[PDB]
Amino acid sequence: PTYAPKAGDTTRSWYVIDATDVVLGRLAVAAANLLRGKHKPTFAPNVDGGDFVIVINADKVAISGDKLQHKMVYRHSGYPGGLHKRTIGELMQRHPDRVVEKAILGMLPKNRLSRQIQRKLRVYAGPEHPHSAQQPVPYELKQVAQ
Amino acid sequence: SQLKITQVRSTIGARWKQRESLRTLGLRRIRHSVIREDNAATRGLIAVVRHLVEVEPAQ
Amino acid sequence: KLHDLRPARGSKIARTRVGRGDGSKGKTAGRGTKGTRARKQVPVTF
Amino acid sequence: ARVKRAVNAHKKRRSILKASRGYRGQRSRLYRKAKEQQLHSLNYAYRDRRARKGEFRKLWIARINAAARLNDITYNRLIQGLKAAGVEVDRKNLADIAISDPAAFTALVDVARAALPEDVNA
Amino acid sequence: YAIVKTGGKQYKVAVGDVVKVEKLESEQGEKVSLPVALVVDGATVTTDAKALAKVAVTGEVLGHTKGPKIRIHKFKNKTGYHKRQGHRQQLTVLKVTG
Amino acid sequence: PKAKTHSGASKRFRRTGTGKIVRQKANRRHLLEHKPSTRTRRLDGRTVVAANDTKRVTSLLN
Amino acid sequence: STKTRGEVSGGGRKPYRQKGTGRARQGSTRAPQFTGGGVVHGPKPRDYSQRTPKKMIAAALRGALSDRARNGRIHAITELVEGQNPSTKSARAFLASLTERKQVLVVIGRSDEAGAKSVRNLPGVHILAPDQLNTYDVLRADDVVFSVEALNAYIAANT
RNA sequence: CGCGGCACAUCCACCUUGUGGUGGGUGUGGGUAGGGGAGCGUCCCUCAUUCAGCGAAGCCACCGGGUGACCGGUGGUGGA
RNA sequence: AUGCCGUGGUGUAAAGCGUGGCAGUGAGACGGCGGGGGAUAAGCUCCGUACGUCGAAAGGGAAACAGCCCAGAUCGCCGGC
RNA sequence: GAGGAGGGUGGUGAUGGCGUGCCUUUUGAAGAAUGAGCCUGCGAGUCAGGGACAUGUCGCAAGGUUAACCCGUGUGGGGUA
The three-state secondary structure class of C20 is: coil
Question: Which residues are paired to G107 by β-bridges?
Answer: G128, G146
**For helices A24-36 and A96-107, what crossing angle results, to 10°?**
60
Residues A33, A62 contacting (CB under 8 angstroms): no
Elucidation method: cryo-EM
Range of the structural domain that residue B9 is part of? 1-59
How far is it, in rounded angstroms, from Cα E48 to Cα E39? Answer: 11
Q: Which nucleotide is nearest to C28 (CA to C1')?
A: H33
Q: How many domains does chain F fold into?
A: 1
DSSP A74: E
Q: Which of chain F's residues have a Cβ under 8 Å away from the Cβ of C45? A: 6, 60
Distance (Å) from the C-alpha of residue C34 to the closest C-alpha of chain F? Answer: 23
Task: Give Cα D97 to chain centroid, integer Å.
Answer: 18
* Backbone φ and ψ of D107, nearest 5°: -60, -45
Q: Give the span between the Cα atoms of D88 and D82, in whole angstroms.
A: 7
C-beta of residue G153 within 8 angstroms of C-beta of residue G130: yes
Please state the domain extents for chain E. 1-98
Tally the domains of chain A. Answer: 1
Q: β-pairing, F21-24 with F13-15?
A: antiparallel
CA distance D112 to D114: 5
CB A35 within 8 A of CB A121: yes
Rounded CA-CA distance A128/A134 in Å is 15
Q: Which contiguous run of DSSP H or E holds residue B47? A: helix B42-48
Phi, psi angles (nearest 5°) of residue E38 = -160, 130
User: Among all strands, which nt has the closest C1' to B23 (CA)?
Assistant: I12
Note whether F25 and F62 are within 8 A (CB): no
Structural domain harbouring A29: 1-146
Angle (nearest 5°) at CA D80 between D74 and D82: 100
Grouping H, G, I as helix, E, B as strand and the rest as coil, residue G150 is helix
C-alpha distance from C27 to closest chain E C-alpha (Å): 9
What does the alpha-carbon distance between residue A56 and residue A130 come to, in Å, rounded to a whole number?
11
Residue D18 in 3-state DSSP?
helix
Dihedral in degrees, nearest 10, Cα atoms G51, G52, G55, G60? -120
> Could you count the other beta carbons within 10 Å of the beta carbon of residue D105?
23
Q: Does the CB of D56 fall within 7 Å of any strand J atom?
A: no
| Distances, alpha carbon A28 to alpha carbons A71, A115, A122, D32, in Å | 17, 16, 13, 51
DSSP letter at C15 equals P
The helix (run of H) or strand (run of E) holding residue F14 is strand F13-15
* Residue E57: its H or E element: strand E57-61
CA distance A56 to A140: 12
Sheet holding G74-76, edge to edge: G74-76, G144-146, G104-107, G125-128
The answer to whether some atom of strand J lies closer than 7 Å to the beta carbon of C36 is no
List chain J nucleotides near protein: any atom < 7 Å from a Cβ. Answer: 11-19, 21-26, 29-30, 38-53, 56-60, 64-67, 71-79
Give a three-class secondary structure readout of G85-115: CCCHHHHHHHHHHHCCCCCEEEECCCCCCCC
Cβ–Cβ contacts within 10 Å for residue F41, how many?
Answer: 9
**Does the nearest atom of strand I lie within 7 Å of E81's Cβ?**
yes
Residues 6+ apart with CB under 8 A from G13: G28, G29
Spatial neighbors of D66 by CB under 8 A, at least 6 apart, are A38, A39, A40, A41, A43, D98
**Do the Cβ atoms of D37 and A11 come closer than 8 Å?**
no
Q: Which domain holds residue F35?
A: 1-62
Q: Backbone phi, then psi, for A129, in 5-degree steps? A: -110, 115
What residue in C sits closest to G67 (Cα-Cα)? C1
Report yes or no: D73 and D109 within 8 Å, Cβ to Cβ.
yes
How far apart are the C-alpha atoms of A94 and A96, rounded to whole Å? Answer: 6
Q: CB-based contacts of G58: which residues, under 8 Å, 6+ apart? A: G158
CA dihedral C32, C36, C39, C40 (to 10 degrees): -120
Spatial distance between the Cα atoms of D65 and D59, rounded to a whole number of angstroms: 10
Using the CB atom, is residue E70 less than 7 Å from strand I? yes
Please state whether beta strands G74-76 and A72-76 pair in parallel, antiparallel, or not at all (unpaired): unpaired
- Distance between CA atoms of residues D55 and D103, nearest Å: 27
What contacts A39, CB < 8 A, 6 or more positions away?
A: A33, D66, D69, D70
Say what the resolution is, in angstroms: 3.7
Q: Please give the tally of structural domains in chain B.
A: 1
Distance CA F5, CA F19 (A): 17
Say which residues have a Cβ less than 8 Å from residue C46's Cβ, sequence separation at least 6.
none
